[PDB]
Design an enzyme around this catalytic site. Structure first.
Site, PDB file in Angstrom:
ATOM      1  N   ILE A 199      27.808 -47.606  16.953  1.00 31.85           N
ATOM      2  CA  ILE A 199      28.144 -46.101  16.518  1.00 31.85           C
ATOM      3  C   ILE A 199      26.558 -45.529  16.279  1.00 31.85           C
ATOM      4  CG2 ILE A 199      30.495 -46.189  15.994  1.00 31.85           C
ATOM      5  CD1 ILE A 199      29.712 -46.682  13.097  1.00 31.85           C
ATOM      6  N   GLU A 252      22.044 -45.647  15.606  1.00 32.77           N
ATOM      7  CA  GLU A 252      20.864 -46.250  14.870  1.00 32.77           C
ATOM      8  C   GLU A 252      20.895 -45.711  13.328  1.00 32.77           C
ATOM      9  OE1 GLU A 252      19.018 -48.588  15.889  1.00 32.77           O
ATOM     10  OE2 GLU A 252      20.672 -48.586  17.772  1.00 32.77           O
ATOM     11  N   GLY A 253      20.709 -46.613  12.483  1.00 33.96           N
ATOM     12  CA  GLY A 253      20.359 -46.492  11.254  1.00 33.96           C
ATOM     13  C   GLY A 253      18.543 -46.508  10.785  1.00 33.96           C
ATOM     14  N   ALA A 254      18.217 -46.624   9.705  1.00 36.22           N
ATOM     15  CA  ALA A 254      16.700 -46.497   9.819  1.00 36.22           C
ATOM     16  C   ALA A 254      16.111 -48.113  10.146  1.00 36.22           C
ATOM     17  CB  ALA A 254      16.225 -46.202   8.572  1.00 36.22           C
ATOM     18  N   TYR A 255      16.977 -49.090   9.709  1.00 35.37           N
ATOM     19  CA  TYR A 255      16.373 -50.480  10.035  1.00 35.37           C
ATOM     20  C   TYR A 255      17.452 -51.255  10.674  1.00 35.37           C
ATOM     21  CZ  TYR A 255      14.111 -48.608   5.951  1.00 35.37           C
ATOM     22  OH  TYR A 255      13.458 -47.970   4.897  1.00 35.37           O
ATOM     23  N   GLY A 256      18.155 -50.862  11.507  1.00 31.33           N
ATOM     24  CA  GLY A 256      18.839 -51.465  12.503  1.00 31.33           C
ATOM     25  C   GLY A 256      20.288 -50.466  13.022  1.00 31.33           C
ATOM     26  N   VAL A 259      24.026 -49.391  14.134  1.00 29.92           N
ATOM     27  CA  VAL A 259      25.368 -49.355  13.005  1.00 29.92           C
ATOM     28  C   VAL A 259      26.717 -49.538  14.067  1.00 29.92           C
ATOM     29  CG1 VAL A 259      26.745 -47.930  11.531  1.00 29.92           C
ATOM     30  CG2 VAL A 259      24.096 -47.814  11.720  1.00 29.92           C
ATOM     31  N   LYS A 273      26.559 -51.499   9.026  1.00 31.25           N
ATOM     32  CA  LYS A 273      25.164 -51.153   9.372  1.00 31.25           C
ATOM     33  C   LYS A 273      24.230 -52.471   9.174  1.00 31.25           C
ATOM     34  CE  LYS A 273      24.418 -47.852   5.520  1.00 31.25           C
ATOM     35  NZ  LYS A 273      23.709 -48.816   4.246  1.00 31.25           N
ATOM     36  N   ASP A 294      17.529 -36.353  -0.312  1.00 21.66           N
ATOM     37  CA  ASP A 294      17.670 -36.420   1.244  1.00 21.66           C
ATOM     38  C   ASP A 294      19.201 -35.909   1.555  1.00 21.66           C
ATOM     39  OD1 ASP A 294      16.858 -36.343   4.134  1.00 21.66           O
ATOM     40  OD2 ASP A 294      17.435 -38.416   4.359  1.00 21.66           O
TER      41      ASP A 294
END
Length: 353
Positions: free
Chosen positions: A24, A26-30, A32, A47, A142
């Protein structure tokens, strides 16, 4: 598979409890994935986070974990579970399991023109959840449409606290806060002018940008860069008053603003002729150039636009606010891995207590 389940050729080792994986995003570090929780019998969002090679990734991962782990609020995403290796050496990834939300405001505004009842209800939820965040001495930093999750029955939840941080009022932060925070189009004026000495009011601004976007299905200040973003702001708000230029502590910053051509204040009802009058008043109070004169979350909830939802007794605050001990995280990545290993231990299979 036989060993860990794969997704896009990548390992997504979420044991036997979570099955039927589905990528589903992309997250910041991988990446999801959504998965079926065999215990709770519902699909959840998981995630994958791999921050151990970098210091800032670890600092940001630790922050989101500690913050969300203490927070318990209806309008704020929670952490349901955390999957990671049994021993620290084996730990290269961390899987954070959270509620699977149908959609988010960014995606909705993409295909939907919101009814005033929806805008009013969504604003109330952002603010009710923001009140709690702020009462805990936390700055989200954010806030934007995509970070506002929505389920099938209009429940809204604030998510992604990766850029969030604790700022204990007992201490002076002027000059120590990280500089390039928030998504550009939702970046308060002061994040550029008073770069390292801003406050929690930057979140109220962000919320104002979200209100305006909810009213027109278009970002209010779609700047192309750091300076243009500033001109986009002054093109609508108009050049700053004298007592504002003065409140800008940075000399060169104040000088740049002064050496800029004059621009009149574009009236709100010109940009949102269709919009509710009260919404435009509260909007005006949220998108104030001067951070001190900007409306605060408790007052924003009390504004007439939200009078049908406003209920201070059902709008809770953090029982245990965060203090300075939470800001002692500018450590080496090795130490941070140990802290992340400790914070997540309670989610390990069989953990007693």
């Amino acid at each position: 598979a036989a060993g860990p389940e794969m997704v896009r050729g990548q390992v997504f080792d979420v044991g036997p409890r979570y099955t039927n994986l589905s990528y589903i995003g992309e997250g910041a570090y991988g990446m999801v994935c959504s998965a079926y929780d065999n215990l709770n019998k519902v699909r959840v969002a998981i995630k994958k986070i791999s921050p151990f090679e970098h210091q800032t990734y670890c600092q940001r991962t630790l922050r989101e974990i500690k913050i969300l782990l203490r927070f318990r609020h209806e309008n704020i995403i929670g952490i349901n579970d955390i999957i990671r290796a049994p021993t620290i050496e084996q730990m290269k990834d961390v899987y954070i399991v959270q509620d699977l939300m149908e959609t988010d405001l960014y995606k909705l505004l993409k295909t939907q023109h919101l009814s005033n009842d929806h805008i009013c209800y969504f604003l109330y939820q952002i603010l009710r959840g923001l009140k709690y965040i702020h009462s805990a001495n936390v700055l989200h930093r954010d806030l934007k449409p995509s970070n506002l999750l929505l389920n099938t029955t209009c429940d809204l939840k604030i998510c992604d606290f990766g850029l969030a941080r604790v700022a204990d009022p007992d201490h002076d932060h002027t000059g120590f806060l990280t500089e390039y925070v928030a998504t550009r189009w939702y970046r308060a004026p002061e994040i550029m002018l008073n770069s390292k000495g801003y406050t929690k009011s930057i979140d109220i601004w962000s919320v104002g940008c979200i209100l305006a976007e909810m009213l027109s299905n278009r970002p209010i200040f779609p700047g192309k860069h750091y300076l243009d973003q500033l001109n986009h702001i002054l093109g609508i708000l108009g050049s700053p008053s004298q007592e504002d230029l003065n409140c800008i502590i940075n000399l060169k910053a104040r000088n740049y603003l002064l050496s800029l051509p004059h621009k009149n204040k574009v009236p709100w009802n010109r940009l949102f002729p269709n919009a509710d009058s009260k919404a435009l008043d509260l909007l005006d109070k949220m998108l104030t150039f001067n951070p001190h004169k900007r409306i605060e979350v408790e007052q924003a909830l009390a504004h007439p636009y939200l009078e049908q939802y406003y209920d201070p007794s059902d709008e809770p605050i953090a029982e245990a606010p965060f203090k300075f001990d939470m800001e002692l995280d500018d450590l080496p990545k090795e130490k941070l891995k140990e802290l992340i290993f400790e914070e997540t231990a309670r989610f390990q299979p069989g953990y007693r207590s």
